[PDB]
């Protein structure tokens, strides 16, 4: 029970967000500590799967990954107490007021952090499976941390159609290279300031496009830099695709150029 904590020490306040397997509250830890707690409503998931993804980070831990803390599970509901990121998902943030407020300097600074923590998991020999702006929370100080790890692996984690790679979608080949592919779609997600990959289309008519070597055109503005340091990630040939460190690294060099 190492990672064990008694109830009554958790006081739920704000509702934050929810899904098809529970919700996320803004509670307190023995008061004095802003904390988010993952719900998990019975008959929806389980109690080992919710306590399954709780072990992943229960052993991942890095400065770029919303790290655990403690769990609360000795009688429904089941809890997963982790770091709090006032700002919320990077997707919403960039769509909010101050979101579009900032510019490249900070934007370029983001893909860098995702790329960094991403380079981490690449070492730990893992895969996120759902790496998209929605899964990245922002620190109350504008720091980038990779959240969620339900689909994380070393029976299916793919859902993010408009992010998954042709291989893992075509032949079920999810690999670090799958996430690389995803970093481009994620990059595209910030320069446009939160637009959905391949607008107008339906994740249903996306399966296709690929088959036919379809890729989105450079973004209306974004410097070739990121755009080409974007085509890197989309190299159909899983191989041709860079490794994070590289991205991570190149996202630093071609960065300062900005500031």
Word description of this protein:
The chain is α+β, with helices and mostly antiparallel strands and 259 residues long. It folds into 2 domains: 1-84, Phosphorylase Kinase, domain 1 (2-Layer Sandwich); 85-259, Transferase(Phosphotransferase) domain 1 (Transferase(Phosphotransferase), domain 1). 32% of the residues lie in helices and 10% in strands. It has 9 helices and 8 strands.
Question: What is the helical fraction, as a range of percent?
Answer: 25-40%
Distance between the termini: 47 Å
Number of helices, where a helix is a run of at least 4 consecutive DSSP H or I residues: 9
CA radius of gyration is: 19 Å
For the record, the CATH architecture of the largest domain stands as: Orthogonal Bundle
CATH superfamily of the largest domain: Transferase(Phosphotransferase) domain 1
- Strand arrangement in the largest pleated sheet: 1-2-3-5-4
Going by helix content, strand content and strand pairing, the class is: alpha+beta
CATH topology of the largest domain: Transferase(Phosphotransferase), domain 1
Main β-sheet description: 5 strands, antiparallel
The ordered H/E elements are EEEHEEEHHHEEHHHHH
